[PDB]
RNA sequence: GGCUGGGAAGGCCCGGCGGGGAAGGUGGCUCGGCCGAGUGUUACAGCCCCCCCGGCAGCAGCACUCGCCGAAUCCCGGGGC
RNA sequence: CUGCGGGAUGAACCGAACGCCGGGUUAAGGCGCCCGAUGCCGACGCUCAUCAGACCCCAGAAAAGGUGUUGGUUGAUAUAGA
RNA sequence: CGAAGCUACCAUCUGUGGGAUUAUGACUGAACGCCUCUAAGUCAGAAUCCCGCCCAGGCGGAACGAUACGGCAGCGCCGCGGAGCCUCGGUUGGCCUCGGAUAGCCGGUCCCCCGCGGGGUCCGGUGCGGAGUGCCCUUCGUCCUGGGAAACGGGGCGCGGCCGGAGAGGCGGCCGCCCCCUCGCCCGUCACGCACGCCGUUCGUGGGGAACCUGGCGCUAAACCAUUCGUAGACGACCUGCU
């Protein structure tokens, strides 16, 4: 027979293949469309999760009743150090999809970009890009590097920058940089390729790519759970308390006839660390690391212009199972997915 | 040795029936420009047909169910295979075979692609009647390439306009060297002619 | 845009059928797809016959739609149908292909010999013609 | 120096819907299309050519690794150039949509 | 059945000058050019008489659908000469009972604001097909003049101003607002 | 070999008879260079078609394969399994 | 109590009944591919369906309608002008 | 009373845009000298359908880095050689316009426009396609000399430069220098185990895979386990640190 009372369902078909996902950092499956006008400018940025703390403003919403009083918002702390940009890879577009043309790498690299090539690097003889970087050094190299970018300037659609963040200047344990390709949306491809090469082995802070009341969005891991009923995965109804073979169970899972269990039935399994990309994140305040003229100035990360003190984002005693964040930040509005010391990306918005 | 056969302005299952017959007798069989084969009746009747393919799911576990592929291509590539015994080992040989391209890739690019009159539109159906365009349904049902296609085909088609212009400048001073020439080989076009050549 | 028109008097080539490869004059229409035909000077009765198997030439000859098989041989005589034919390139063509079809081992032998000398020959004046055109442009 | 047999397609065993009889293929003779131009292959001798693993005679050489089946053409099959040919040994199923030679030498020139 | 032959004949006048790429007519004078392309029919177009003088079209072996063409062929050209003779200019008045329907003209003709229609605050923006011009017309109070050679474009203009006023959820036999098409006339008479 | 002792047709035609399509003609009109082409009206035959009077080998199920039944009114040769 | 060819599938349907084989020819059925064969320069017409149609048993439709289209029957009026 | 951690619309943050169209309303327009959303053709059109945002990512691809200096080693590119196991398909190639079918192909373009080339007008040749896949290209015996027509062509995986080609490029073109050869087409002139009629002959092949004998130019490992960490976790797996 048919169901009495109609009731909706329980969890979302559109997100649940529930494993954990085999990627770590967020990956940008789908960059903003470049408008071959606006100046050339990257669409993501790599930070790390840090902490949540209060944040009080007056609204300014005409029509509402709250309109021109003292709100406080939740409000997010992603410590974003600028992030070093060491290759660059351009993507041609093909009728079977987008496919890699040239990756080109910069002369110089990292430490910390070097230690993601490797799985164990106490083990390793830190071999990594040794005779490529013979190719900056050599006439032919040069002869050779020209060209590709050539050829990568009259064939290549996409142009992608790989850039690497900085893991020394954060209180994270772990030593191995996160590597990144960031799509950059600009003018023509020639002038975007100019810009990537000149951009190359330099700096990239979080003022040039995102910029104070600006809707982004945040991709990352969701803090994981481990294994889970369905009564907290998929948050089903508790059975009553007399029944025998227990409670936090789904009673019913499907019809006789069809002799199979549909993939729509909510079944105990993986909770968490589910890949996600949350929209619509408010930049209340980018706010600026610690800088020394004659002494420390650490008033420009939470003193304002109504609070004229010489206060530091971080709490005291730092952040709780984070650290001390002491370079740039982005102060963004809510919560954002992920557990503490988690690398966030930050993507521009997809949408006018 | 590899037969290589152009889908544009061929109906679909007229020309899928002629390439598996062929493929079932050791034939290498190469189909391009997908997107060009067009289906007998209206648009409107062609896309709910295959809306009503795309509704057919499996419903307790659709990841088993059928492989609606999007792709000209791959839609030609199906509809030989329902033509073809694929459950055999001729049939999966047979498909092995047989390679279909999306629009008509750089190593076939440079190749005499070959019509079949059997499967053709202007042939097969009356000019009083409608058809659908497959790139048009694909793209409508879900292909995302159809531009990148297009663009691609379009500096093809400028390319093999310059050879062209080349080739036929070629005949022409072929012909005036012919021309020029014919004094000191009359007795070789005579003997040609005499056995039905050159008339 | 058509220029042969189905009307009493042309001549058709007959493409396929018992009297195939022949010329026959049309001398009434029958039916929409069935045309009344006559041969007399090609050795070709008066028959029924449809359009398909038969492709109508340029030539067309006046004599009254219900001619009695004379006037219409009359009409051909006069105006010497198979002598116009032969001249034209079709029957030109149509022999050229007979020929091949009857060669035979000896003549494709022959056929062969000439085609390579005339083929290097042709390939040595073109050679010349393209280098004196790459110099002229030089 | 060139070749002195006419290529043909081994297309299949003599048979129904759901019967066959292996003891006569069906031959798929290249450039010809209907039963009219078929005359000339009938009573022709056919080989099927394969090479296996260990070494076989040969007549007028050194033993080699390829071995044939022949076979004799009897009649056509079906308006459309097919023919049926009979093997002393039955094809091993193998060769479906493989290349046999039709040899040109039961001549009736 | 098949009919045998179909035939029909216009006689364009002296003043202009069609052409027939095969299938596709240009028909060129003083107002400007018409182009149509005649495909997907299966009629023969000749172009008949020194100095170009008429138009003949041939239907061969047709059923009845196929003869029913040779005739819609025809006032196409018919349409296409007088467009580019004269012209083709549609007049609409404003109707309303209390609300004044207020209709601007915003960059030449294309773009088309209606405001105040049943006292909505919502501007309806119409565009304009290419070619048509829209005005609005003097000696009249609420009057809109759409000019432009095309036929069915002025027509389709016409069309798309007149669908974007519709009373929703009303009785129209009640709320008789909007703007129609009250004259279908040409540029210039002669 | 038989038929309607085959039907029409092919060639020379001769002395007549009536009817019809509507033609080297006439003719309203239209289109090009007196001529050519397209339409219409009475309509003899100098385009022809049909019927009645009357006769020549040219026939013959005819390789001008336009449409049958066939075999002591029937025999020969050849190819394939 | 019955196998075999066809009806995709199959008690009773069509053909046809059984020793083991080679060659030839059929019945019922078919000849775009699956799958042997129309890969005929097959003949004449009908049909557009945004629910087309596709072969005894048999697996599916009724009454009422349609200037959609193709034929037939009957009845008036039209150069004294429909 | 309560740290940390989990958790509650019991606290807090976020939840998107296009395409085709259904019903419908229309434009031009005959059938049916009038009229008609329909017969050809065209417009607007939605919780619809599809795609986009988002989750996973194919017995599917991508370019890039390092590629075992060792105390015995093992490899990567080049060239020309010898046997040595397995697996086989085969039996000259075509190196290319777009395109329409009630229409097209080729030149010159006196003429004009545009970036040697393209477009338009006019003219001239074909169109059951001879600038035909009913097609074209190459010959499929060798060597001696001894004449004629034709004739500077080719080769030595000939050596060095200049390019075209990105869709899944994987191939070709254009120039310099050394040596060698007289090859295509017709005629004499002989000789090639002439193996005495008997079948898998003849080639793409120096085919593809595995194990071994010649040199030149370059190489120096990373992965896993063990340990540790918690952003992870039933166990695996995962994020990390360690001259």
């Given at each position: 027979?048919?169901?009495?009372?109609?009731?909706?369902?329980?969890?979302?078909?559109?997100?649940?293949?529930?494993?954990?996902?085999?990627?770590?950092?967020?990956?940008?499956?789908?960059?903003?469309?470049?408008?071959?006008?606006?100046?050339?400018?990257?669409?993501?940025?790599?930070?790390?999760?840090?902490?949540?703390?209060?944040?009080?403003?007056?609204?300014?919403?005409?029509?509402?009743?709250?309109?021109?009083?003292?709100?406080?918002?939740?409000?997010?702390?992603?410590?974003?150090?600028?992030?070093?940009?060491?290759?660059?890879?351009?993507?041609?577009?093909?009728?079977?999809?987008?496919?890699?043309?040239?990756?080109?790498?910069?002369?110089?690299?990292?430490?910390?970009?070097?230690?993601?090539?490797?799985?164990?690097?106490?083990?390793?003889?830190?071999?990594?890009?040794?005779?490529?970087?013979?190719?900056?050094?050599?006439?032919?190299?040069?002869?050779?590097?020209?060209?590709?970018?050539?050829?990568?300037?009259?064939?290549?659609?996409?142009?992608?920058?790989?850039?690497?963040?900085?893991?020394?200047?954060?209180?994270?344990?772990?030593?191995?940089?996160?590597?990144?390709?960031?799509?950059?949306?600009?003018?023509?491809?020639?002038?975007?390729?100019?810009?990537?090469?000149?951009?190359?082995?330099?700096?990239?802070?979080?003022?040039?790519?995102?910029?104070?009341?600006?809707?982004?969005?945040?991709?990352?891991?969701?803090?994981?759970?481990?294994?889970?009923?369905?009564?907290?995965?998929?948050?089903?109804?508790?059975?009553?308390?007399?029944?025998?073979?227990?409670?936090?169970?789904?009673?019913?899972?499907?019809?006789?006839?069809?002799?199979?269990?549909?993939?729509?039935?909510?079944?105990?399994?993986?909770?968490?660390?589910?890949?996600?990309?949350?929209?619509?994140?408010?930049?209340?305040?980018?706010?600026?690391?610690?800088?020394?003229?004659?002494?420390?100035?650490?008033?420009?990360?939470?003193?304002?212009?109504?609070?004229?003190?010489?206060?530091?984002?971080?709490?005291?005693?730092?952040?709780?199972?984070?650290?001390?964040?002491?370079?740039?930040?982005?102060?963004?509005?809510?919560?954002?997915?992920?557990?503490?010391?988690?690398?966030?990306?930050?993507?521009?918005?997809?949408?006018? | 040795?590899?037969?290589?056969?152009?889908?544009?302005?061929?109906?679909?299952?007229?020309?899928?029936?002629?390439?598996?017959?062929?493929?079932?007798?050791?034939?290498?069989?190469?189909?391009?420009?997908?997107?060009?084969?067009?289906?007998?009746?209206?648009?409107?009747?062609?896309?709910?047909?295959?809306?009503?393919?795309?509704?057919?799911?499996?419903?307790?576990?659709?990841?088993?169910?059928?492989?609606?592929?999007?792709?000209?291509?791959?839609?030609?590539?199906?509809?030989?295979?329902?033509?073809?015994?694929?459950?055999?080992?001729?049939?999966?040989?047979?498909?092995?075979?047989?390679?279909?391209?999306?629009?008509?890739?750089?190593?076939?690019?440079?190749?005499?692609?070959?019509?079949?009159?059997?499967?053709?539109?202007?042939?097969?159906?009356?000019?009083?009647?409608?058809?659908?365009?497959?790139?048009?349904?694909?793209?409508?049902?879900?292909?995302?390439?159809?531009?990148?296609?297009?663009?691609?085909?379009?500096?093809?088609?400028?390319?093999?306009?310059?050879?062209?212009?080349?080739?036929?400048?070629?005949?022409?001073?072929?012909?005036?060297?012919?021309?020029?020439?014919?004094?000191?080989?009359?007795?070789?076009?005579?003997?040609?002619?005499?056995?039905?050549?050159?008339? | 845009?058509?220029?042969?028109?189905?009307?009493?008097?042309?001549?058709?080539?007959?493409?396929?059928?018992?009297?195939?490869?022949?010329?026959?004059?049309?001398?009434?229409?029958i039916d929409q797809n069935r045309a009344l035909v006559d041969g007399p000077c090609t050795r070709v009765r008066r028959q029924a016959m449809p359009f398909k198997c038969m492709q109508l030439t340029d030539f067309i000859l006046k004599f009254p739609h219900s001619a009695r098989q004379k006037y219409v041989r009359k009409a051909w005589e006069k105006a010497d149908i198979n002598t116009k034919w032969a001249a034209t390139r079709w029957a030109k063509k149509i022999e050229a292909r007979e020929r091949?079809?009857?060669?035979?081992?000896?003549?494709?032998?022959?056929?062969?010999?000439?085609?390579?000398?005339?083929?290097?020959?042709?390939?040595?004046?073109?050679?010349?013609?393209?280098?004196?055109?790459?110099?002229?442009?030089? | 120096?060139?070749?002195?047999?006419?290529?043909?397609?081994?297309?299949?065993?003599?048979?129904?819907?759901?019967?066959?009889?292996?003891?006569?293929?069906?031959?798929?003779?290249?450039?010809?299309?209907?039963?009219?131009?078929?005359?000339?292959?009938?009573?022709?001798?056919?080989?099927?050519?394969?090479?296996?693993?260990?070494?076989?005679?040969?007549?007028?050489?050194?033993?080699?690794?390829?071995?044939?089946?022949?076979?004799?053409?009897?009649?056509?099959?079906?308006?459309?150039?097919?023919?049926?040919?009979?093997?002393?040994?039955?094809?091993?199923?193998?060769?479906?949509?493989?290349?046999?030679?039709?040899?040109?030498?039961?001549?009736?020139? | 059945?098949?009919?045998?032959?179909?035939?029909?004949?216009?006689?364009?006048?002296?003043?202009?000058?069609?052409?027939?790429?095969?299938?596709?007519?240009?028909?060129?004078?003083?107002?400007?050019?018409?182009?149509?392309?005649?495909?997907?029919?299966?009629?023969?177009?000749?172009?008949?008489?020194?100095?170009?003088?008429?138009?003949?079209?041939?239907?061969?072996?047709?059923?009845?659908?196929?003869?029913?063409?040779?005739?819609?062929?025809?006032?196409?050209?018919?349409?296409?000469?007088?467009?580019?003779?004269?012209?083709?200019?549609?007049?609409?008045?404003?109707?309303?009972?209390?609300?004044?329907?207020?209709?601007?003209?915003?960059?030449?003709?294309?773009?088309?604001?209606?405001?105040?229609?049943?006292?909505?605050?919502?501007?309806?923006?119409?565009?304009?097909?290419?070619?048509?011009?829209?005005?609005?017309?003097?000696?009249?109070?609420?009057?809109?003049?759409?000019?432009?050679?095309?036929?069915?474009?002025?027509?389709?203009?016409?069309?798309?101003?007149?669908?974007?006023?519709?009373?929703?959820?009303?009785?129209?036999?009640?709320?008789?607002?909007?703007?129609?098409?009250?004259?279908?006339?040409?540029?210039?008479?002669?």
């Amino acid at each position: 027979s048919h169901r009495k009372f109609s009731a909706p369902r329980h969890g979302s078909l559109g997100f649940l293949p529930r494993k954990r996902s085999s990627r770590h950092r967020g990956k940008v499956k789908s960059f903003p469309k470049d408008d071959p006008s606006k100046p050339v400018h990257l669409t993501a940025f790599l930070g790390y999760k840090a902490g949540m703390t209060h944040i009080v403003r007056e609204v300014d919403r005409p029509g509402s009743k709250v309109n021109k009083k003292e709100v406080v918002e939740a409000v997010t702390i992603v410590e974003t150090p600028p992030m070093v940009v060491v290759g660059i890879v351009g993507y041609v577009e093909t009728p079977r999809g987008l496919r890699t043309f040239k990756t080109v790498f910069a002369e110089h690299i990292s430490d910390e970009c070097k230690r993601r090539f490797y799985k164990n690097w106490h083990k390793s003889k830190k071999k990594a890009f040794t005779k490529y970087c013979k190719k900056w050094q050599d006439d032919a190299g040069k002869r050779q590097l020209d060209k590709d970018f050539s050829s990568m300037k009259k064939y290549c659609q996409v142009i992608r920058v790989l850039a690497h963040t900085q893991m020394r200047l954060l209180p994270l344990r772990q030593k191995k940089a996160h590597l990144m390709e960031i799509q950059v949306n600009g003018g023509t491809v020639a002038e975007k390729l100019d810009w990537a090469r000149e951009r190359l082995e330099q700096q990239v802070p979080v003022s040039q790519v995102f910029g104070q009341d600006e809707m982004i969005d945040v991709i990352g891991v969701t803090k994981g759970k481990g294994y889970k009923g369905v009564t907290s995965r998929w948050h089903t109804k508790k059975l009553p308390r007399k029944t025998h073979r227990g409670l936090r169970k789904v009673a019913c899972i499907g019809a006789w006839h069809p002799a199979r269990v549909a993939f729509s039935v909510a079944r105990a399994g993986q909770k968490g660390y589910h890949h996600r990309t949350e929209i619509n994140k408010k930049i209340y305040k980018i706010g600026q690391g610690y800088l020394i003229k004659d002494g420390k100035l650490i008033k420009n990360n939470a003193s304002t212009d109504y609070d004229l003190s010489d206060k530091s984002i971080n709490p005291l005693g730092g952040f709780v199972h984070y650290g001390e964040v002491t370079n740039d930040f982005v102060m963004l509005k809510g919560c954002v997915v992920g557990t503490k010391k988690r690398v966030l990306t930050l993507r521009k918005s997809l949408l006018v | 040795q590899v037969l290589v056969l152009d889908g544009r302005g061929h109906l679909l299952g007229r020309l899928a029936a002629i390439v598996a017959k062929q493929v079932l007798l050791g034939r290498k069989v190469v189909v391009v420009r997908c997107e060009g084969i067009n289906i007998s009746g209206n648009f409107y009747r062609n896309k709910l047909k295959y809306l009503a393919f795309l509704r057919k799911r499996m419903n307790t576990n659709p990841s088993r169910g059928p492989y609606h592929f999007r792709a000209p291509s791959r839609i030609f590539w199906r509809t030989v295979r329902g033509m073809l015994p694929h459950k055999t080992k001729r049939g999966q040989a047979a498909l092995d075979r047989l390679k279909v391209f999306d629009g008509i890739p750089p190593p076939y690019d440079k190749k005499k692609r070959m019509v079949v009159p059997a499967a053709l539109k202007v042939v097969r159906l009356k000019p009083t009647r409608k058809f659908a365009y497959l790139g048009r349904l694909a793209h409508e049902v879900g292909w995302k390439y159809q531009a990148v296609t297009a663009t691609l085909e379009e500096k093809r088609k400028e390319k093999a306009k310059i050879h062209y212009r080349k080739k036929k400048q070629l005949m022409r001073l072929r012909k005036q060297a012919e021309k020029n020439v014919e004094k000191k080989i009359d007795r070789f076009t005579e003997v040609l002619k005499t056995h039905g050549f050159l008339v | 845009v058509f220029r042969r028109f189905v009307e009493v008097g042309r001549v058709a080539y007959v493409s396929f059928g018992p009297h195939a490869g022949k010329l026959v004059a049309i001398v009434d229409v029958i039916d929409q797809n069935r045309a009344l035909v006559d041969g007399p000077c090609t050795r070709v009765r008066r028959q029924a016959m449809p359009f398909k198997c038969m492709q109508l030439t340029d030539f067309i000859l006046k004599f009254p739609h219900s001619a009695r098989q004379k006037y219409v041989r009359k009409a051909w005589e006069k105006a010497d149908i198979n002598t116009k034919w032969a001249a034209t390139r079709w029957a030109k063509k149509i022999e050229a292909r007979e020929r091949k079809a009857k060669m035979t081992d000896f003549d494709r032998y022959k056929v062969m010999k000439a085609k390579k000398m005339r083929n290097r020959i042709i390939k040595n004046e073109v050679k010349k013609l393209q280098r004196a055109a790459l110099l002229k442009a030089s | 120096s060139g070749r002195l047999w006419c290529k043909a397609i081994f297309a299949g065993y003599k048979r129904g819907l759901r019967n066959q009889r292996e003891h006569t293929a069906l031959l798929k003779i290249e450039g010809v299309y209907a039963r009219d131009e078929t005359e000339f292959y009938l009573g022709k001798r056919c080989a099927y050519v394969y090479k296996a693993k260990n070494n076989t005679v040969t007549p007028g050489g050194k033993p080699n690794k390829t071995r044939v089946i022949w076979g004799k053409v009897t009649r056509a099959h079906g308006n459309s150039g097919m023919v049926r040919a009979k093997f002393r040994s039955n094809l091993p199923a193998k060769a479906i949509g493989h290349r046999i030679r039709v040899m040109l030498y039961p001549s009736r020139i | 059945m098949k009919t045998i032959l179909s035939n029909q004949t216009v006689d364009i006048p002296e003043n202009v000058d069609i052409s027939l790429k095969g299938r596709t007519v240009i028909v060129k004078g003083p107002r400007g050019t018409l182009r149509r392309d005649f495909n997907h029919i299966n009629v023969e177009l000749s172009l008949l008489g020194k100095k170009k003088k008429r138009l003949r079209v041939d239907k061969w072996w047709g059923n009845r659908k196929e003869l029913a063409t040779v005739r819609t062929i025809c006032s196409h050209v018919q349409n296409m000469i007088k467009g580019v003779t004269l012209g083709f200019r549609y007049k609409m008045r404003s109707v309303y009972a209390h609300f004044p329907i207020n209709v601007v003209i915003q960059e030449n003709g294309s773009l088309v604001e209606i405001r105040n229609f049943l006292g909505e605050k919502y501007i309806r923006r119409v565009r304009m097909r290419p070619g048509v011009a829209c005005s609005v017309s003097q000696a009249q109070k609420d009057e809109l003049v759409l000019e432009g050679n095309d036929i069915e474009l002025v027509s389709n203009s016409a069309a798309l101003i007149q669908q974007a006023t519709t009373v929703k959820n009303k009785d129209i036999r009640k709320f008789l607002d909007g703007i129609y098409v009250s004259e279908k006339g040409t540029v210039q008479q002669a």
